[PDB]
Design an enzyme around this catalytic site. Structure first.
Site, mmCIF file in Angstrom:
data_model
loop_
_atom_site.group_PDB
_atom_site.id
_atom_site.type_symbol
_atom_site.label_atom_id
_atom_site.label_comp_id
_atom_site.label_asym_id
_atom_site.label_seq_id
_atom_site.Cartn_x
_atom_site.Cartn_y
_atom_site.Cartn_z
ATOM 1 N N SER A 121 5.445 5.418 8.723
ATOM 2 C CA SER A 121 4.856 5.211 7.388
ATOM 3 C C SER A 121 5.930 5.388 6.302
ATOM 4 O O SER A 121 6.659 6.368 6.316
ATOM 5 C CB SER A 121 3.739 6.206 7.093
ATOM 6 O OG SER A 121 3.295 6.001 5.752
ATOM 7 N N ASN A 137 5.157 6.101 3.361
ATOM 8 C CA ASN A 137 4.382 6.778 2.310
ATOM 9 C C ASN A 137 4.169 8.264 2.526
ATOM 10 O O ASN A 137 3.314 8.889 1.879
ATOM 11 C CB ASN A 137 3.045 6.064 2.128
ATOM 12 C CG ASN A 137 3.231 4.597 1.818
ATOM 13 O OD1 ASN A 137 4.100 4.233 1.008
ATOM 14 N ND2 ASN A 137 2.425 3.751 2.442
ATOM 15 N N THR A 138 4.966 8.821 3.427
ATOM 16 C CA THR A 138 4.970 10.261 3.641
ATOM 17 C C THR A 138 6.415 10.726 3.661
ATOM 18 O O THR A 138 7.202 10.267 4.505
ATOM 19 C CB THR A 138 4.206 10.633 4.928
ATOM 20 O OG1 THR A 138 2.814 10.305 4.752
ATOM 21 C CG2 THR A 138 4.356 12.128 5.250
ATOM 22 N N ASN A 184 5.821 -1.255 11.573
ATOM 23 C CA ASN A 184 5.096 -0.814 10.380
ATOM 24 C C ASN A 184 5.437 -1.696 9.176
ATOM 25 O O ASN A 184 6.121 -2.714 9.323
ATOM 26 C CB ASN A 184 5.434 0.664 10.066
ATOM 27 C CG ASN A 184 4.226 1.445 9.517
ATOM 28 O OD1 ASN A 184 3.548 1.009 8.554
ATOM 29 N ND2 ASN A 184 3.968 2.615 10.110
ATOM 30 N N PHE A 224 -1.621 8.410 4.070
ATOM 31 C CA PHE A 224 -2.386 9.047 5.179
ATOM 32 C C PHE A 224 -3.647 9.773 4.665
ATOM 33 O O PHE A 224 -3.872 10.947 4.986
ATOM 34 C CB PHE A 224 -1.555 10.092 5.955
ATOM 35 C CG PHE A 224 -0.493 9.538 6.890
ATOM 36 C CD1 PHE A 224 0.600 10.349 7.239
ATOM 37 C CD2 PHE A 224 -0.618 8.288 7.501
ATOM 38 C CE1 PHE A 224 1.578 9.902 8.167
ATOM 39 C CE2 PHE A 224 0.365 7.823 8.396
ATOM 40 C CZ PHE A 224 1.459 8.618 8.716
ATOM 41 N N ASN A 267 0.812 -1.212 0.000
ATOM 42 C CA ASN A 267 0.000 0.000 0.000
ATOM 43 C C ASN A 267 0.852 1.273 0.000
ATOM 44 O O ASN A 267 1.971 1.319 0.594
ATOM 45 C CB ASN A 267 -0.963 0.003 1.189
ATOM 46 C CG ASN A 267 -0.339 0.573 2.444
ATOM 47 O OD1 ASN A 267 -0.407 1.795 2.700
ATOM 48 N ND2 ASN A 267 0.293 -0.284 3.214
ATOM 49 N N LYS A 271 5.533 4.026 17.096
ATOM 50 C CA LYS A 271 5.511 2.933 16.117
ATOM 51 C C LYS A 271 6.665 3.080 15.126
ATOM 52 O O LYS A 271 6.808 4.104 14.449
ATOM 53 C CB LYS A 271 4.171 2.881 15.367
ATOM 54 C CG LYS A 271 4.089 1.715 14.392
ATOM 55 C CD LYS A 271 2.660 1.508 13.920
ATOM 56 C CE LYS A 271 2.582 0.337 12.941
ATOM 57 N NZ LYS A 271 1.149 0.222 12.558
HETATM 58 C C1 LIG Z 1 -3.701 -0.958 3.730
HETATM 59 C C2 LIG Z 1 -2.746 -0.645 4.856
HETATM 60 C C3 LIG Z 1 -2.833 0.602 5.472
HETATM 61 C C4 LIG Z 1 -2.100 0.869 6.626
HETATM 62 N N1 LIG Z 1 -2.214 2.114 7.233
HETATM 63 C C5 LIG Z 1 -1.513 2.375 8.398
HETATM 64 C C6 LIG Z 1 -1.634 3.612 9.048
HETATM 65 O O1 LIG Z 1 -2.461 4.463 8.718
HETATM 66 N N2 LIG Z 1 -0.898 3.837 10.177
HETATM 67 C C7 LIG Z 1 -0.053 2.877 10.697
HETATM 68 O O2 LIG Z 1 0.558 3.125 11.723
HETATM 69 N N3 LIG Z 1 0.068 1.652 10.089
HETATM 70 C C8 LIG Z 1 -0.639 1.401 8.936
HETATM 71 N N4 LIG Z 1 -0.515 0.158 8.321
HETATM 72 C C9 LIG Z 1 0.482 -0.794 8.869
HETATM 73 C C10 LIG Z 1 -0.194 -1.828 9.764
HETATM 74 O O3 LIG Z 1 -0.711 -1.164 10.897
HETATM 75 C C11 LIG Z 1 0.830 -2.889 10.194
HETATM 76 O O4 LIG Z 1 1.874 -2.252 10.918
HETATM 77 C C12 LIG Z 1 1.442 -3.626 8.987
HETATM 78 O O5 LIG Z 1 0.520 -3.740 7.899
HETATM 79 C C13 LIG Z 1 2.006 -4.987 9.410
HETATM 80 O O6 LIG Z 1 0.992 -5.847 9.899
HETATM 81 P P1 LIG Z 1 0.244 -6.966 8.972
HETATM 82 O O7 LIG Z 1 1.286 -7.726 8.206
HETATM 83 O O8 LIG Z 1 -0.624 -7.829 9.845
HETATM 84 O O9 LIG Z 1 -0.629 -6.229 7.966
HETATM 85 C C14 LIG Z 1 -1.263 -0.125 7.174
HETATM 86 C C15 LIG Z 1 -1.148 -1.364 6.528
HETATM 87 C C16 LIG Z 1 -1.889 -1.639 5.384
HETATM 88 C C17 LIG Z 1 -1.972 -3.082 4.917
HETATM 89 O O1 LIG Z 2 -1.336 5.676 4.937
HETATM 90 C C1 LIG Z 2 -0.422 4.934 4.548
HETATM 91 O O2 LIG Z 2 -0.005 4.951 3.362
HETATM 92 C C2 LIG Z 2 0.342 4.052 5.490
HETATM 93 C C3 LIG Z 2 0.706 4.504 6.762
HETATM 94 C C4 LIG Z 2 1.490 3.652 7.557
HETATM 95 O O3 LIG Z 2 1.837 4.010 8.699
HETATM 96 N N1 LIG Z 2 1.859 2.457 7.088
HETATM 97 C C5 LIG Z 2 1.477 2.042 5.861
HETATM 98 O O4 LIG Z 2 1.819 0.915 5.435
HETATM 99 N N2 LIG Z 2 0.721 2.843 5.072
#
Ligand SMILES: Cc1cc2nc3c(=O)[nH]c(=O)nc-3n(C[C@H](O)[C@H](O)[C@H](O)COP(=O)(O)O)c2cc1C
Ligand SMILES: O=C(O)c1cc(=O)[nH]c(=O)[nH]1
Ligand SMILES: CCOc1cccc(-c2ccc(NC(=O)/C(C#N)=C(/C)O)cc2)c1
EC number: 1.3.5.2
Length: 361
Positions: free
Chosen positions: A180, A182-183, A249, A114, A110, A220
């Protein structure tokens, strides 16, 4: 709520009919309406961060970015819910498409960037259920709020400060999301001097809230940090008495062996290929902080074994997101049931006994 039906029929059908972002959006909608498909053993209860958690399996940030499905998520069986990331002002995030599935790798990439309804919208949404949440929290079902920063913001520390002021009074814990991928420039906030200055400000803001409205503060972190980066974080966390860490993350790395056609898309990689990189980061952070700083372990958790590995590496709690997108809601009960069996099998009296166990052998 049958695992096989979801895994083999419902999810692949959904994934065949909609693009990943649309599927996510429908998932949030559906969850929020509480239309969904395990009784938690005392063995799964964890006390940390000034709270009881009835089970240690939480929904990671990013699934419910805007706090729309919190109650539906508790109904799914999650022991705690984390919403966000939330930015001060609303912002749209990156152009679409910005989410990509790698089914051969049980992974997602992804680059949302944000996308957020912003602090004010989320504040009112949480206020509408503040007392309901107060009772859930007391019942062992805490709420975390993950804070981000706006793309065009000049002053990153003031963005987080605003988040603390606005959503801190509604949260059991806050997350300073400094990881993140992505910022632009965000991950540089993980550097020592930047981090100390940022977190000093965050903690002062938090400390200025009234006692009943005063959340724990966690940081985080990325799975892509250098050894020096990790040393510095551990040092700052202990210097300031940060309440905990969320590890990790998504990764900007692309591990050898990824098969998905979309493996070279820009963004954060999640799911199975992240799993052990995350576990190893938990293991290192736990050692560097002497087991004294609570860790929420996240990345690639799809099973009881995945959960227990992070727990024995030093996590007090775990979260998942990507597994839900492959297996659907039955994955939550599956993780919990398997974790419970493994705890018994390995001679642990409960989750608490297993936390950091690898460091003691
Ligand atoms: C679609 C997507 C969006 C995410 N958005 C955020 C986010 O807004 N803030 C954040 O701290 N982590 C975000 N994450 C990271 C997850 O919180 C997590 O740290 C990461 O995906 C690893 O866990 P997983 O393998 O179970 O998905 C996002 C992950 C994905 C898949
Ligand atoms: O908003 C996102 O693009 C995003 C935020 C984040 O903390 N981690 C991530 O995988 N995506
Ligand atoms: C019949 C309902 O089954 C459900 C119920 C509640 C949620 C889900 C579900 C949850 C998450 C997703 N998410 C994705 O598929 C996805 C992708 N890609 C992301 C980024 O969330 C999809 C469906 C499916």
């Amino acid at each position: 709520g049958d695992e096989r039906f979801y895994a083999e029929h419902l999810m692949p059908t959904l994934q065949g009919l909609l693009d990943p972002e649309s599927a996510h959006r429908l998932a949030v909608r559906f969850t929020s309406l509480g239309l969904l498909p395990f009784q938690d053993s005392d063995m799964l209860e964890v006390r940390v961060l000034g709270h009881k958690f009835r089970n240690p399996v939480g929904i990671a940030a990013g699934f419910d970015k805007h706090g729309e499905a919190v109650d539906g998520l508790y109904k799914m069986g999650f022991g705690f819910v984390e919403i966000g990331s939330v930015t001060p002002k609303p912002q749209e995030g990156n152009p679409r498409p910005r989410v990509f599935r790698l089914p051969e790798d049980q992974a997602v990439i992804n680059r949302y960037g944000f996308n957020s309804h912003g602090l004010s919208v989320v504040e009112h949404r949480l206020r509408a259920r503040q007392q309901k949440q107060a009772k859930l929290t007391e019942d062992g079902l805490p709420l975390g709020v993950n804070l981000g920063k706006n793309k065009t913001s000049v002053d990153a520390a003031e963005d987080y400060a605003e988040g603390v002021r606005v959503l801190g009074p509604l949260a059991d814990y806050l997350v300073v999301n400094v990881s993140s991928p992505n910022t632009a420039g965000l991950r540089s906030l993980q550097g020592k001097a930047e981090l100390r200055r940022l977190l000093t400000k965050v903690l002062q803001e938090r400390d200025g809230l009234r006692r009943v409205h005063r959340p724990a503060v966690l940081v985080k972190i990325a799975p892509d940090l250098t050894s020096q980066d990790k040393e510095d974080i551990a040092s700052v966390v202990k210097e300031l008495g940060i309440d905990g860490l969320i590890v990790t993350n998504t990764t900007v790395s692309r591990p050898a062996g990824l098969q998905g056609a979309l493996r070279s898309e820009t963004g954060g990689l999640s799911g199975k290929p992240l799993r052990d990189l995350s576990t190893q980061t938990i293991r290192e952070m736990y050692a560097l902080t002497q087991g004294r700083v609570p860790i929420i372990g996240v990345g690639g958790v799809s099973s009881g074994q995945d959960a227990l590995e992070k727990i024995r590496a030093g996590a007090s709690l775990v979260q998942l997101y990507t597994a839900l997108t492959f297996w659907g809601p039955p994955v939550v009960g599956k993780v919990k049931r398997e974790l419970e069996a493994l705890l018994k099998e390995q001679g642990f009296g409960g989750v608490t006994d297993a936390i950091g166990a690898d460091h003691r052998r």
